[PDB]
Amino acid sequence: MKVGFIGLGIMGKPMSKNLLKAGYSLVVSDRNPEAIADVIAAGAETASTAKAIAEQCDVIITMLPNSPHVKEVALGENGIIEGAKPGTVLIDMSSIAPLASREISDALKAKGVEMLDAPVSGGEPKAIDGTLSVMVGGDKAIFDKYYDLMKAMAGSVVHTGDIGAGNVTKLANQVIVALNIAAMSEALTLATKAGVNPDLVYQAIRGGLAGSTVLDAKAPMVMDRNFKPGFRIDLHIKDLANALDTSHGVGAQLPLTAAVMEMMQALRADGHGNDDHSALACYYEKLAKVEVTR
């Protein structure tokens, strides 16, 4: 097993380093040569194209921002499909529209290339420490074959259905993450405006029914004025767009997501698109005229 890994960003880079630590041999690529250099310094090899990675690796992980990027890497000129022999597996760990996962899977299947959609959750801290949750769609046999590989980056790896089900699960995930952040922001801004120190609020509630992974990850960032990604608002906008599109296709009911989407549009318009999604707090701060600080 040489394992391909394409996309060495905020999530991808630490994930690849966990695979190296677990003893896997990697051939890596990214648009940033410095990101490649960092991962080769940890033990990886590299190649000049996705096609060349696919020529050398029986399994390839992608960790990319959106469907256009995955489509270019998987299907485009010098892409995976041009180098992959029948039986090669793509594990796309990107968060992309479920329809796009299915489209890319069908295109790869025509060449005999298999695919799992295995997006993740846990944020940069859990990408680093290897305790991500992974949620996967595709064939059970392929899931079972690469469970250990995926588990080397993760605290949990769960099969959720056929191809695309990983990304459907990730849409549900991203609805929860956005709303949990917004809810934290709404509540902390209320308490601050009403004259109670939000750090004492955080300490007081974190152990009860209001406790969450978002609360412990993001309340400190907000109060310390640290909005460095992390996970950019612009990427969360793409995920909510996908969630809303899916909801409108199947007739689900997404009122709170629809509201938080408009908040994120306001944040993007006010220069916060490249901030961590904890910057949802800044929306509330600006409307309530108070800052949530230590």
Return binding residues for NAD(+): 4-18, 95, 238
| Residues that bind Cl ion in the complex, under the rule CB under 5 A | 66-67, 96-97
DSSP state of 154: E
Q: Is the peptide bond between 230 and the residue preceding it cis, with omega within 30 degrees of 0?
A: yes
**Least distance (Å) between residue 182 CB and Cl ion:** 22
Beta carbon nearer to Cl ion, 46 or 67? 67
193 included as an active-site residue: no
CA distance 145 to 291: 50
Query: What SS3 class is residue 34?
Result: helix
- Ranked by CB distance to Cl ion, the top (closest) residue is 67
**Least distance (Å) between residue 281 CB and Cl ion:** 26
**Least distance (Å) between residue 42 CB and Cl ion:** 29
Looking at 51, 126, 170, 218, which residue is catalytic?
170
What are the two backbone dihedrals, phi and then psi, of residue 166, each rounded to the nearest 5 degrees?
-60, -50
Q: Residue 292: which region, alpha, beta or left (left: phi > 0; alpha: psi -120 to 50)?
A: beta
CA distance 164 to 83: 24
Task: Please say whether the beta carbons of 152 and 19 come within 8 A.
Answer: yes
**Least distance (Å) between residue 242 CB and Cl ion:** 6
**Least distance (Å) between residue 243 CB and Cl ion:** 11
Task: Please say whether the beta carbons of 74 and 81 come within 8 A.
Answer: yes
CA distance 130 to 84: 28
CA distance 290 to 294: 13
Beta carbon nearer to Cl ion, 96 or 181? 96
CA distance 96 to 174: 12
Beta carbon nearer to Cl ion, 239 or 285? 239
Beta carbon nearer to Cl ion, 31 or 225? 31
Query: What SS3 class is residue 2?
Result: strand
Beta carbon nearer to Cl ion, 97 or 116? 97
Catalytic residues: 170
